[PDB]
Amino acid sequence: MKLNISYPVNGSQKTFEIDDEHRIRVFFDKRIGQEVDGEAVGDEFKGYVFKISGGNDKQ
Amino acid sequence: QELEGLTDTTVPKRLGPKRANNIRKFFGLSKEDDVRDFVIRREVTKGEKTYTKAPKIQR
Amino acid sequence: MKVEIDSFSGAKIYPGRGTLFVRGDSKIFRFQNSKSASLFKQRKNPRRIAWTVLFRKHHKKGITEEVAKKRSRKTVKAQRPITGASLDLIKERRSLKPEVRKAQREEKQKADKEKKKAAKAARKAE
RNA sequence: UGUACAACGGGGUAUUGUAAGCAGUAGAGUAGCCUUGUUGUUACGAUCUGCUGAGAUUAAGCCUUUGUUGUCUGAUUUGU
RNA sequence: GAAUGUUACCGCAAUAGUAAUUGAACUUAGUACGAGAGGAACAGUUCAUUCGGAUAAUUGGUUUUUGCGGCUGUCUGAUCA
RNA sequence: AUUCAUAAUAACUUUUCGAAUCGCAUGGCCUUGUGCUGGCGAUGGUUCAUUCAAAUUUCUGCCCUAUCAACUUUCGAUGGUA
RNA sequence: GAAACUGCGAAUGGCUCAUUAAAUCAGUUAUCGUUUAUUUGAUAGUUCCUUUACUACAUGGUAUAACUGUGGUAAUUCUAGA
Numbered sequence: 365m366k367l368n369i370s371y372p373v374n375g376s377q378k379t380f381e382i383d384d385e386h387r388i389r390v391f392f393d394k395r396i397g398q399e400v401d402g403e404a405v406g407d408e409f410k411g412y413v414f415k416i417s418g419g420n421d422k423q
Numbered sequence: 424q425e426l427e428g429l430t431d432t433t434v435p436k437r438l439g440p441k442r443a444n445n446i447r448k449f450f451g452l453s454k455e456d457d458v459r460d461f462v463i464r465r466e467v468t469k470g471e472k473t474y475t476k477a478p479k480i481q482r
Numbered sequence: 483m484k485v486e487i488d489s490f491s492g493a494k495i496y497p498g499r500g501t502l503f504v505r506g507d508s509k510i511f512r513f514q515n516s517k518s519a520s521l522f523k524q525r526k527n528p529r530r531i532a533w534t535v536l537f538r539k540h541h542k543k544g545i546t547e548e549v550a551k552k553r554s555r556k557t558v559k560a561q562r563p564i565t566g567a568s569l570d571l572i573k574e575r576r577s578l579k580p581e582v583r584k585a586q587r588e589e590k591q592k593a594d595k596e597k598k599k600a601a602k603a604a605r606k607a608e
Numbered sequence: 609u610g611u612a613c614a615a616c617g618g619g620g621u622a623u624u625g626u627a628a629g630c631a632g633u634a635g636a637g638u639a640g641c642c643u644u645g646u647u648g649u650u651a652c653g654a655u656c657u658g659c660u661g662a663g664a665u666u667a668a669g670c671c672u673u674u675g676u677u678g679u680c681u682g683a684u685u686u687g688u
Numbered sequence: 689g690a691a692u693g694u695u696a697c698c699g700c701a702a703u704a705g706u707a708a709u710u711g712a713a714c715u716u717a718g719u720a721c722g723a724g725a726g727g728a729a730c731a732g733u734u735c736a737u738u739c740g741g742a743u744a745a746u747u748g749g750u751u752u753u754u755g756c757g758g759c760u761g762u763c764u765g766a767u768c769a
Numbered sequence: 770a771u772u773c774a775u776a777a778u779a780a781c782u783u784u785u786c787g788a789a790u791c792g793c794a795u796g797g798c799c800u801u802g803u804g805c806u807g808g809c810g811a812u813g814g815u816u817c818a819u820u821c822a823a824a825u826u827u828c829u830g831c832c833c834u835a836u837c838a839a840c841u842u843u844c845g846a847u848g849g850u851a
Numbered sequence: 852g853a854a855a856c857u858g859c860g861a862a863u864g865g866c867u868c869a870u871u872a873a874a875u876c877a878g879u880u881a882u883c884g885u886u887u888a889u890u891u892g893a894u895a896g897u898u899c900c901u902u903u904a905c906u907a908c909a910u911g912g913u914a915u916a917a918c919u920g921u922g923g924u925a926a927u928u929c930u931a932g933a
Contacts, residue, residue, distance in 0.1 A: 369921090376933085416932095434562075436562045437920095444907095461575060498745075533624090624757065803909100820890070825884085825885085826881065
């Protein structure tokens with residue numbers, strides 16, 4: 365899928381296209397407001413923790 | 424590890440305050456420090472001429 | 483193989499098991515067993531049946547999963563660029579709180595110019 | 609006279625659908641009380657909630673067992 | 689089921705009986721054939737019909753498990769049972 | 770024509786309204802301070818009135834039918850009290 | 852001076868005559884039985900709440916659009932995130 369990730373401190377934002385479904389399966393069964401760490405989905409996001417704010421689906 | 428597109432780069436707040444007390448708390452000055460001097464101005468280049476358009480002060 | 487959920491009891495259905503019912507509005511229901519199917523035919527409600535997941539949910543039994551969402555208390559801690567402020571000079575000017583006598587020094591010349599302009603207008607009126 | 613057998617028990621899996629008793633500022637409301645109320649308390653009251661996916665039953669043609677207690681020499685017949 | 693020396697096991701097989709059946713679709717091919725109209729088949733594959741023999745994982749039925757629960761009337765003083 | 774208008778007492782209100790608004794002219798007083806006063810307006814606002822209306826409403830008035838003479842009233846139909 | 856917010860308006864106008872036969876409607880009354888944006892004219896000295904530091908009254912506070920940029924979907928006067 366795609367991740368629109370925003371670093372509000374600097375005020376920046378960027379898209380990231382992701383594959384490897386069993387990485388992104390972490391996000392499953394979560395609410396908009398919960399947090400997750402990033403090495404589980406990508407080691408580039410090691411030590412990072414993101415919160416969810418929303419999103420869009422197909423259609 | 425820092426992300427080239429979000430963490431490394433940083434972006435500006437496109438505007439500054441327009442409200443007086445907002446400025447006073449932005450710079451933490453006083454109830455008396457003559458905010459008219461602490462104004463943010465945005466120089467432009469329409470051509471050879473330039474100007475900064477210090478916006479306004481409501482309240 | 484997908485593992486489906488009972489429309490009535492919320493229990494889990496493995497393949498080859500239970501039934502599936504299709505109602506005149508083109509809707510689907512999945513039943514694990516003739517028990518659930520029979521109560522559905524008797525048009526009971528699961529919220530009043532005591533062995534159902536919906537019941538246990540609505541009565542908050544085994545509800546130790548969800549706890550709470552905490553409260554955040556933290557400042558921005560980042561002076562961002564105003565894009566016409568030059569954040570270095572902006573920190574220099576936010577640090578210029580003392581020496582406010584320059585404000586009154588400029589106000590003195592401004593007041594002098596005010597009286598000068600009043601006099602000039604009153605004279606040009608003549 | 610033993611990875612022996614049985615009867616009981618324990619556990620598993622199943623079925624049903626949340627036991628009795630106790631408590632509750634739950635309860636349609638109603639009588640009565642006096643310290644008269646500043647929820648004032650006492651009696652009635654189907655029912656509801658909690659202890660309670662509890663309790664009960666579970667091999668008679670289910671499974672299993674480091675458990676407890678016992679049983680394990682009676683009669684008859686047969687020959688190239 | 690007596691008798692074949694007894695008893696037990698593993699087996700041979702004389703004889704007797706016998707069961708599998710039919711169709712459609714796709715492709716073959718709008719090909720062959722024929723002026724055109726129209727219009728096939730063999731092989732292959734997927735299914736089905738009728739019949740039979742077993743089975744009971746699942747679905748369904750059955751329910752004296754009178755297993756669980758509920759309901760009525762009545763009787764056990766009431767409650768429980 | 771009134772329990773009208775209005776006023777007064779007792780209180781009540783989760784509390785209403787009572788200008789943190791804006792453009793021009795910029796003027797007068799001085800113990801000359803960014804001192805004190807000061808105009809023409811626009812907007813908005815509580816209530817009364819008015820106007821624009823609106824809703825109900827009085828009286829009287831409507832075509833053919835009797836091969837429609839009985840209708841309404843269960844649960845609103847007529848009226849009364851709240 | 853585009854855009855966007857705010858305030859107004861969009862309930863006027865225009866079209867048609869299906870329904871509707873004491874219903875509409877006409878003419879005539881009434882509101883001492885009511886609401887009324889708008890106009891128009893009048894119209895708040897009383898609001899510091901233990902109201903002697905409780906206070907900015909040269910005037911108090913938080914958002915948020917537009918905009919920056921990231922994106923979604925086939926599409927729509929769709930939109931989220933920062």
